[PDB]
Amino acid sequence: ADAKALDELRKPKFSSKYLIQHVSQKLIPAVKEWEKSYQPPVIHLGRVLSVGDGIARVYGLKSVQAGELVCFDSGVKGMALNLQADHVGVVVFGNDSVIHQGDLVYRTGQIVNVPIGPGTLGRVTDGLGQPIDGKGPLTNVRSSLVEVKAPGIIARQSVREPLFTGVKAVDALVPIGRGQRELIIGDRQTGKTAVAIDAIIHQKNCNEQVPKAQRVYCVYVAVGQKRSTVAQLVKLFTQTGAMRYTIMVSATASDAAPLQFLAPYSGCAMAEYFRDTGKHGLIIYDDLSKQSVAYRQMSLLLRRPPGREAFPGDVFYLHSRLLERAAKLSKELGGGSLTAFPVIETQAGDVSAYIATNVISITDGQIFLETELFYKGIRPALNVGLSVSRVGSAAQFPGMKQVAGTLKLELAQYREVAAFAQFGSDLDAATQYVLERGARLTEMLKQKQFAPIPIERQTVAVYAATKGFLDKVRVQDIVAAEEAVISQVNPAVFKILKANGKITPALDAHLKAELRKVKLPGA
Amino acid sequence: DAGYVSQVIGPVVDVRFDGELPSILSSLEVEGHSVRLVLEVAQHMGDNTVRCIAMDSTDGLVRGQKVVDTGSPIKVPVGRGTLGRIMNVIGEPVDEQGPIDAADIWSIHREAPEFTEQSTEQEILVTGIKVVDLLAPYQRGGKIGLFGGAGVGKTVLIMELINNVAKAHGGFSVFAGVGERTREGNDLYREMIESGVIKLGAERGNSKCTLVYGQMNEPPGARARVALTGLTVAEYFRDIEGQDVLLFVDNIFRFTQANSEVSALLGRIPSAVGYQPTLATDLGGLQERITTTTKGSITSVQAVYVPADDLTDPAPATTFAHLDATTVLSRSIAELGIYPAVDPLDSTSRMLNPNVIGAEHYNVARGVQKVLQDYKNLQDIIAILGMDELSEEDKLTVARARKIQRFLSQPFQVAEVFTGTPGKYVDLADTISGFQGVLTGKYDDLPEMAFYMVGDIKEVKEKADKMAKDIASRKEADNKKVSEELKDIPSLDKLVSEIKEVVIEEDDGLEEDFKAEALSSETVVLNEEGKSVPLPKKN
Ligand SMILES: Nc1ncnc2c1ncn2[C@@H]1O[C@H](COP(=O)(O)OP(=O)(O)OP(=O)(O)O)[C@@H](O)[C@H]1O
Ligand SMILES: Nc1ncnc2c1ncn2[C@@H]1O[C@H](COP(=O)(O)OP(=O)(O)O)[C@@H](O)[C@H]1O
Ligand SMILES: [Mg+2]
Numbered sequence A: 001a002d003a004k005a006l007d008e009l010r011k012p013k014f015s016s017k018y019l020i021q022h023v024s025q026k027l028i029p030a031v032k033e034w035e036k037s038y039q040p041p042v043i044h045l046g047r048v049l050s051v052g053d054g055i056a057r058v059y060g061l062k063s064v065q066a067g068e069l070v071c072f073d074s075g076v077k078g079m080a081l082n083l084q085a086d087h088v089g090v091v092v093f094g095n096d097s098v099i100h101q102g103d104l105v106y107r108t109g110q111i112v113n114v115p116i117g118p119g120t121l122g123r124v125t126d127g128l129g130q131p132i133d134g135k136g137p138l139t140n141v142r143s144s145l146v147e148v149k150a151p152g153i154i155a156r157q158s159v160r161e162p163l164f165t166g167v168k169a170v171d172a173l174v175p176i177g178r179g180q181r182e183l184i185i186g187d188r189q190t191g192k193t194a195v196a197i198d199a200i201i202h203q204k205n206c207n208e209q210v211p212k213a214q215r216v217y218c219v220y221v222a223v224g225q226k227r228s229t230v231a232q233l234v235k236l237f238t239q240t241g242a243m244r245y246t247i248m249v250s251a252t253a254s255d256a257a258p259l260q261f262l263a264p265y266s267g268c269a270m271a272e273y274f275r276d277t278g279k280h281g282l283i284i285y286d287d288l289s290k291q292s293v294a295y296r297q298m299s300l301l302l303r304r305p306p307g308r309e310a311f312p313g314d315v316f317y318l319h320s321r322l323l324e325r326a327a328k329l330s331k332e333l334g335g336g337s338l339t340a341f342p343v344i345e346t347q348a349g350d351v352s353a354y355i356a357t358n359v360i361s362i363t364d365g366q367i368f369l370e371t372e373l374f375y376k377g378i379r380p381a382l383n384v385g386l387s388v389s390r391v392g393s394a395a396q397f398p399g400m401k402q403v404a405g406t407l408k409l410e411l412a413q414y415r416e417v418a419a420f421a422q423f424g425s426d427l428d429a430a431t432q433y434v435l436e437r438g439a440r441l442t443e444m445l446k447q448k449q450f451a452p453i454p455i456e457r458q459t460v461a462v463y464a465a466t467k468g469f470l471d472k473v474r475v476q477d478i479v480a481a482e483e484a485v486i487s488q489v490n491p492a493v494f495k496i497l498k499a500n501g502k503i504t505p506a507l508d509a510h511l512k513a514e515l516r517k518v519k520l521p522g523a
Numbered sequence B: 001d002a003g004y005v006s007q008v009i010g011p012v013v014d015v016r017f018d019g020e021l022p023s024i025l026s027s028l029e030v031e032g033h034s035v036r037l038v039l040e041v042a043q044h045m046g047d048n049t050v051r052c053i054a055m056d057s058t059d060g061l062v063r064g065q066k067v068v069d070t071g072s073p074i075k076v077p078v079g080r081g082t083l084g085r086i087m088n089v090i091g092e093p094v095d096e097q098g099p100i101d102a103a104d105i106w107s108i109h110r111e112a113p114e115f116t117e118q119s120t121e122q123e124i125l126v127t128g129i130k131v132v133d134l135l136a137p138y139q140r141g142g143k144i145g146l147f148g149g150a151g152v153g154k155t156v157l158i159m160e161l162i163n164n165v166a167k168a169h170g171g172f173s174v175f176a177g178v179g180e181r182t183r184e185g186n187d188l189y190r191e192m193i194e195s196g197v198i199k200l201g202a203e204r205g206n207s208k209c210t211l212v213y214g215q216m217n218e219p220p221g222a223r224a225r226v227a228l229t230g231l232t233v234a235e236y237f238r239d240i241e242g243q244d245v246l247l248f249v250d251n252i253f254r255f256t257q258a259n260s261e262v263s264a265l266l267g268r269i270p271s272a273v274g275y276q277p278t279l280a281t282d283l284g285g286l287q288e289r290i291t292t293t294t295k296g297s298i299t300s301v302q303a304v305y306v307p308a309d310d311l312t313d314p315a316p317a318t319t320f321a322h323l324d325a326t327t328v329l330s331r332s333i334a335e336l337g338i339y340p341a342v343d344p345l346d347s348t349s350r351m352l353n354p355n356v357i358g359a360e361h362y363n364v365a366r367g368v369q370k371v372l373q374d375y376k377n378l379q380d381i382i383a384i385l386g387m388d389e390l391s392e393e394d395k396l397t398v399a400r401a402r403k404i405q406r407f408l409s410q411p412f413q414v415a416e417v418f419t420g421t422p423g424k425y426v427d428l429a430d431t432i433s434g435f436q437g438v439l440t441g442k443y444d445d446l447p448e449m450a451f452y453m454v455g456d457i458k459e460v461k462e463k464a465d466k467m468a469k470d471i472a473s474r475k476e477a478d479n480k481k482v483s484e485e486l487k488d489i490p491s492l493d494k495l496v497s498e499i500k501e502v503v504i505e506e507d508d509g510l511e512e513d514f515k516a517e518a519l520s521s522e523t524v525v526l527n528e529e530g531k532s533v534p535l536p537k538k539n
């Protein structure tokens, strides 16, 4: 059975010819008698062997590349994922009910690509770039690969520009940066998308204010969501005007599993146009926990062996190569940036889940949203003891950095005494004074939905709480007390605070003067 | 002569050879690829087919693409020419400054040093960190593990170990960035231009650190081999140069994780929690090469990420046996604001021995761990009672241990860019005597949080001077303060007038450089001849 005597059998050893001389003139009239059932032989095209569950096994396709767009004869696109010795495993970009056994598969020649450019700015596309908003095809646009590698060490620079989100629980405690990847992680219905929508809405308020190059172009990637939630979100972005700077990639729950797998890469390539041209991008991978489930479906049906929670082994590389494309480029590459907000949903607060611990180790910061802080009135439900940021200083407002340093510090003294509030001894006026002030700082960070705050109005509202001017206010009406602090304080103190960037001591006098001129209705 | 691509499933390529298969661990080059694709032979499949792992992405690979054999494993440049350079997994310069001018390129695959060429001497590597140098002192020539989850401070701790030790070392260092963020690989590169550890241009040879980077965007073949690439540079400075080396490996966990991402595609059924069946011998094959021989020395500091703060996970639990020192960073210490967040009990070193560091350093180290374990057993009854009836013998062991938890914290030189206070270097004799006074009871005179974020014992003693000045402030509230306007304060309307005019061009900068090409509404495919045609109108 060894291959030495088996390849020796290539040499002729027949020693008789009473079949070779007989059937050679008998074979061609026998093949021609059944040639109605012969499909024509295939070499560089493809032919479907088996199709099912969104996976086509394709015979032929000799010269296809790995990860290459193929096209079936019914018009539906595919992607050659695992090139095996006798067939090609193709994931189907759509419904596999139009594919039969014996359909011709056509190689398109190109690796998978999406339209990128200024023409995508304002459109709702699917997970491959085709517009689903019903506004015609994409004009003023060009094609770019979805699998661009991340910029390396020599291409990047340090994250120094802020990119405020408009949520003062974020912008004071967990400051985002301009090329920073920050995770928004929490349970179901804890306000994950809210924190990300308030970031996109706040960029529209800032893009009509900054000189043409600090403008931030948002991309919302809606993976696995239902289609009516996405339409409920374009309606919010159009009535706000945020849809002028926003692209929306939406591979919904009815789409195929390779469309939801590819939509974070499709949306990142559209957001990489602004990073690679000197502009600034902001991408939200909403339900990145749903991309890994879509990628798990393809690999289990490509018969790749499962791992932790039946996920593929390379599911860390699924999210690490996606998020590392969010960078801040150097001056020789334009100076542009791209900051990512991936969203991971946990199950019953289990942070120790498999996909959850991967993206925590990939991203810079975390925004933890707990469902028990959500029902205590704290909205956004930010867990301050768990939400960290890698940049810390030099990526927030310099005026906020003076007044939020004594907020992150003084909220730690509030949590260290909350495990000592069942006895009620409250000795030596220390554990009771910080329990009165720390309760007045968590009510400061509470804010509404779809109404982000400018950073000059955030660094004045928390100026008024870490310092005096709110010491004799009840903890039930601080949320209405800032409407005195924002409106009744003379609004030219915000213009000089926005233009300076820090709280100058000439302005520290007027911020202490005009905060005594206001009458707070707390009584 | 050469081989051809038989099968591409993810990052794992099957290459078939018509006679003369390459060896296992040998390097293969793929001919005709867009970039330089390097395959390392993982196994022999059996029907004249080898199975490989790719060092770059396998997108674009064609079945039948020509693959040549280099006849050797992955060889990288080593020597003085790699100092002050950033290297790839395969030895390419990714710092965009010429080629790497290094002689005698070395294979990244060798076996461990033998049992006879092992050193047994134990000299203390003084760090400057008073939780490291007191409770789990490091060993020069030994192996240090910085355990801890995500966000507890492994990279900041390994950055303070660089500017304390690797700057005042004299010998060469090697940073091996294995599967980490490219942002912090750029932050390490840029602040070693400023500190002078890496010099560029004609003074390149005066550099003291070789960078080898295999970060998170790389495929799992490159992440699984870049820890051998940086170790090969450290093994050249140990063996041939005879020097003392500092090998900093950020997240050796990513070496074990990258071998797990290819393990099921190499045809291995999985072991426990989800790692490869070869988890203890792939990690043990790497860690035993990082030793101090009789030729030279390697002092290795390795960050070890524990998944979800679980020290019982088998990838950090396998690393514990390979380490002389162990710095377990805890999230519970970090959430109290204590930095570096070193667990004072869970951290262990081979140097914590009275025959090595002396019975005076040893007894104050065990005395701190005694009072800190007693505080951990008293916090059960404090939350039920209140700590007011403990008759001042257990209230003294609470008040002394709470001073010790603050005094184990320290400002770092690399952490002043996000904290504000400058870092402190504490000497070895200055922290043994500082922790003796809190233990024997010299410094109950000082308040409890005066020990927080200081250096020497003469800094807490002067922080209690500042803390009792500033609480003797805030006594006057009438006048002669900044809030009166007639001193130097302009009017709020005049202050607005010094705002410089910023302009807005209202066009968002999009019509100036873009090549808006035409995208076909039709789909365009290739026929049997390879020629571009429209899709045939037949379903
Ligand atoms: N700051 C806030 N103030 C008030 N309500 C809020 C706030 N943030 C979120 N909510 C509300 O909480 C609910 C959940 O918010 P959101 O949709 O962002 O959660 P989610 O985690 O994305 O949920 P799902 O898992 O259903 O997608 C909604 O009713 C939303 O309006
Ligand atoms: N020594 C330190 N001093 C002060 N803050 C620190 C220190 N180490 C870490 N931190 C804080 O905690 C975070 C975790 O640090 P990092 O080294 O990035 O952790 P890891 O590598 O374990 O994720 C930092 O971004 C910073 O906010
Ligand atoms: Mg949502």
Ligand SMILES: [Mg+2]
Pocket: B154, B155, B180
């Ligand atoms: Mg790290």
